[PDB]
Design an enzyme around this catalytic site. Structure first.
Site, PDB file in Angstrom:
ATOM      1  N   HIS A 142       0.943  -1.015  -0.336  1.00 15.73           N
ATOM      2  CA  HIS A 142       0.343  -0.027  -0.292  1.00 15.73           C
ATOM      3  C   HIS A 142       0.728   1.434  -0.001  1.00 15.73           C
ATOM      4  O   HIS A 142       0.775   2.551  -0.642  1.00 15.73           O
ATOM      5  CB  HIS A 142      -0.652  -0.307   1.516  1.00 15.73           C
ATOM      6  CG  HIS A 142      -1.394   1.736   1.694  1.00 15.73           C
ATOM      7  ND1 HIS A 142      -3.053   1.547   1.300  1.00 15.73           N
ATOM      8  CD2 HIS A 142      -1.107   2.614   1.898  1.00 15.73           C
ATOM      9  CE1 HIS A 142      -3.834   2.715   1.446  1.00 15.73           C
ATOM     10  NE2 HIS A 142      -2.747   3.070   2.285  1.00 15.73           N
ATOM     11  N   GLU A 143       1.879   1.238   0.921  1.00  9.47           N
ATOM     12  CA  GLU A 143       2.853   2.642   1.166  1.00  9.47           C
ATOM     13  C   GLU A 143       3.109   2.811  -0.222  1.00  9.47           C
ATOM     14  O   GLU A 143       3.925   3.542  -0.128  1.00  9.47           O
ATOM     15  CB  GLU A 143       3.516   2.300   2.429  1.00  9.47           C
ATOM     16  CG  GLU A 143       2.108   2.235   3.898  1.00  9.47           C
ATOM     17  CD  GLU A 143       1.240   3.110   3.903  1.00  9.47           C
ATOM     18  OE1 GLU A 143       1.593   4.431   3.521  1.00  9.47           O
ATOM     19  OE2 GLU A 143       0.414   3.460   5.212  1.00  9.47           O
ATOM     20  N   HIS A 146       1.858   4.225  -3.440  1.00 10.40           N
ATOM     21  CA  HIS A 146       2.014   5.257  -2.393  1.00 10.40           C
ATOM     22  C   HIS A 146       2.979   6.193  -3.698  1.00 10.40           C
ATOM     23  O   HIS A 146       2.545   7.094  -4.693  1.00 10.40           O
ATOM     24  CB  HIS A 146       2.019   6.245  -1.151  1.00 10.40           C
ATOM     25  CG  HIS A 146       0.243   6.351  -1.264  1.00 10.40           C
ATOM     26  ND1 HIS A 146      -0.896   6.206  -1.773  1.00 10.40           N
ATOM     27  CD2 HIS A 146      -0.889   5.555   0.268  1.00 10.40           C
ATOM     28  CE1 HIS A 146      -1.880   6.275  -0.531  1.00 10.40           C
ATOM     29  NE2 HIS A 146      -1.534   5.650   0.654  1.00 10.40           N
ATOM     30  N   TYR A 157      -4.397  14.318  -2.964  1.00  8.45           N
ATOM     31  CA  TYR A 157      -4.544  13.398  -1.733  1.00  8.45           C
ATOM     32  C   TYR A 157      -5.924  14.232  -1.124  1.00  8.45           C
ATOM     33  O   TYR A 157      -5.628  14.649   0.133  1.00  8.45           O
ATOM     34  CB  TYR A 157      -3.348  14.089  -0.749  1.00  8.45           C
ATOM     35  CG  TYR A 157      -3.450  11.973   0.373  1.00  8.45           C
ATOM     36  CD1 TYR A 157      -3.386  10.832  -0.598  1.00  8.45           C
ATOM     37  CD2 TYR A 157      -3.756  12.351   1.686  1.00  8.45           C
ATOM     38  CE1 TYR A 157      -3.921   9.513   0.167  1.00  8.45           C
ATOM     39  CE2 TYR A 157      -3.956  11.469   2.501  1.00  8.45           C
ATOM     40  CZ  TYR A 157      -3.511  10.132   1.262  1.00  8.45           C
ATOM     41  OH  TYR A 157      -3.623   8.675   2.319  1.00  8.45           O
ATOM     42  N   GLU A 166      -5.893   6.289  -2.672  1.00 13.29           N
ATOM     43  CA  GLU A 166      -6.043   5.941  -1.514  1.00 13.29           C
ATOM     44  C   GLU A 166      -6.405   3.774  -1.706  1.00 13.29           C
ATOM     45  O   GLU A 166      -5.958   2.949  -1.561  1.00 13.29           O
ATOM     46  CB  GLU A 166      -7.216   6.135  -0.202  1.00 13.29           C
ATOM     47  CG  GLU A 166      -6.916   6.688   0.839  1.00 13.29           C
ATOM     48  CD  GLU A 166      -5.421   5.982   1.645  1.00 13.29           C
ATOM     49  OE1 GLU A 166      -5.588   4.457   1.984  1.00 13.29           O
ATOM     50  OE2 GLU A 166      -4.209   6.220   1.349  1.00 13.29           O
ATOM     51  N   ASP A 226     -10.923  13.631   7.924  1.00 12.18           N
ATOM     52  CA  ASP A 226     -10.155  12.933   6.611  1.00 12.18           C
ATOM     53  C   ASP A 226     -10.030  12.760   5.330  1.00 12.18           C
ATOM     54  O   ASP A 226      -9.856  12.204   4.476  1.00 12.18           O
ATOM     55  CB  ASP A 226     -10.621  11.365   6.651  1.00 12.18           C
ATOM     56  CG  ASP A 226     -10.099   9.884   5.939  1.00 12.18           C
ATOM     57  OD1 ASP A 226      -8.751  10.325   5.665  1.00 12.18           O
ATOM     58  OD2 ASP A 226     -10.648   9.533   5.776  1.00 12.18           O
ATOM     59  N   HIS A 231      -9.647   7.633   3.661  1.00 11.24           N
ATOM     60  CA  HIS A 231      -9.914   6.208   3.851  1.00 11.24           C
ATOM     61  C   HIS A 231     -10.998   6.132   4.094  1.00 11.24           C
ATOM     62  O   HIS A 231     -11.117   4.720   3.837  1.00 11.24           O
ATOM     63  CB  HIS A 231      -8.997   6.296   5.253  1.00 11.24           C
ATOM     64  CG  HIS A 231      -7.471   6.554   4.953  1.00 11.24           C
ATOM     65  ND1 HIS A 231      -6.930   7.482   5.193  1.00 11.24           N
ATOM     66  CD2 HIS A 231      -6.333   5.897   5.063  1.00 11.24           C
ATOM     67  CE1 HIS A 231      -5.852   7.602   4.826  1.00 11.24           C
ATOM     68  NE2 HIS A 231      -5.945   6.188   4.155  1.00 11.24           N
TER      69      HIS A 231
END
Ligand code: CA
Ligand code: CA
Ligand code: CA
Ligand code: CA
Ligand code: ZN
Length: 316
Positions: A142-143, A146, A157, A166, A226, A231
């Site tokens: 996931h990270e 990005h 974002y 996301e 958020d 998310h």
């Protein structure tokens, strides 16, 4: 570090033994020379100065409990590296074998992990909500994903482009999970979330609403929290992705699944050739349909499923 390529051994967060690529020069460093311009793992030593110091070990054995987050962050970056290269012919996150760096032991009791513009960062969690977050391969992928986004589409974002940003990370995080083929699923973060509660997870792609996330456009979040629900609203897109791959009937709309490899292919293309920093949901729909068209023909099943899926989540 300049040195010689070696191979260390240790145990990851969940207690599994794995080999890791290290570099020897007085000490053994968490520096993998076998992938692009290197994979580099650092110790933030419970602080927030980044990246911290390149991980150094005296004997190339990494079985201490303090070592475990580093072992996993290091190894799963490598796995994610190979997914993009073997599956999408992409060399690291910038496509030109950029060095991949990760720091672990970030802050104290930190219940998160993230990409900071330059590198991956992993907390150890507070032991209640989380255990060290690098223990989750879907979390690591996931990270790093990005990074892929930021270099390609560059989805801002916030709001819908942010919820797409996301979802993309959630989607590729899962495909990498499936790739390593160790207890893979369509949940996010289950391997390191709530060690006290079994069977749960941070988010679900197959049924976002299990954790209050939307699974239809009409339930979109439009507040300001958020970053505008990045998310939260990603559940609508993760659901589409799930359905495109696995199929199903959602609010009465039926989707023929086309499998995760095609999903992967369609969304990498979409991400790399059609999405833009400000893309919205409807625009994502258009990018994926075109991607599918490019790939399998305007009248393919693939194209039809992609439409079915976006229909089912209410995205025109
Ligand atoms: Ca050691
Ligand atoms: Ca899993
Ligand atoms: Ca998972
Ligand atoms: Ca749990
Ligand atoms: Zn994310």
């Amino acid at each position: 570090i300049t040195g010689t390529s070696t191979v260390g051994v240790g145990r990851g967060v969940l207690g599994d033994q794995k080999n890791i690529n290290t570099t020897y020069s007085t000490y053994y460093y968490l520096q993998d020379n076998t992938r692009g311009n290197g994979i580099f793992t650092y110790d933030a030593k419970y602080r927030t100065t980044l990246p911290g110091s390149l991980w150094a070990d005296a004997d190339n054995q990494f079985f201490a409990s303090y070592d475990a987050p580093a072992v996993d962050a290091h190894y799963y970056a490598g796995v994610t590296y190979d997914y993009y290269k073997n599956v999408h012919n992409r060399l690291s996150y910038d496509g030109n074998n950029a060095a991949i760096r990760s720091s672990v032991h970030y802050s104290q009791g930190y219940n998160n992990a993230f990409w900071n513009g330059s590198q991956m960062v992993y907390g150890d969690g507070d032991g209640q909500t989380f255990i060290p977050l690098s223990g989750g391969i879907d979390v690591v992928a996931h990270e790093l994903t990005h990074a892929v986004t930021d270099y390609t589409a560059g989805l801002i974002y916030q709001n819908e482009s942010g919820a797409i940003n996301e979802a993309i990370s959630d989607i590729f995080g899962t495909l990498v999970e499936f790739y390593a083929n160790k207890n893979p699923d369509w949940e996010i973060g289950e391997d390191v979330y709530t060690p006290g509660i079994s069977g749960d997870s941070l988010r679900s792609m197959s049924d976002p609403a299990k954790y209050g996330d939307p699974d239809h456009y009409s339930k979109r979040y439009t507040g300001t929290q958020d970053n505008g629900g990045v998310h939260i609203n990603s559940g609508i897109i993760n659901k589409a992705a799930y359905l495109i791959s696995q199929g199903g009937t959602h609010y009465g709309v039926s989707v023929v699944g086309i499998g995760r490899d095609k999903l992967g292919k369609i969304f990498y293309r979409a991400l790399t050739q059609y999405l833009t920093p400000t893309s919205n949901f409807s625009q994502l729909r258009a990018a994926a349909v075109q991607s599918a068209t490019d790939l399998y023909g305007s009248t393919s099943q693939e194209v039809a499923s992609v439409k079915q899926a976006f229909d089912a989540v209410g995205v025109k």
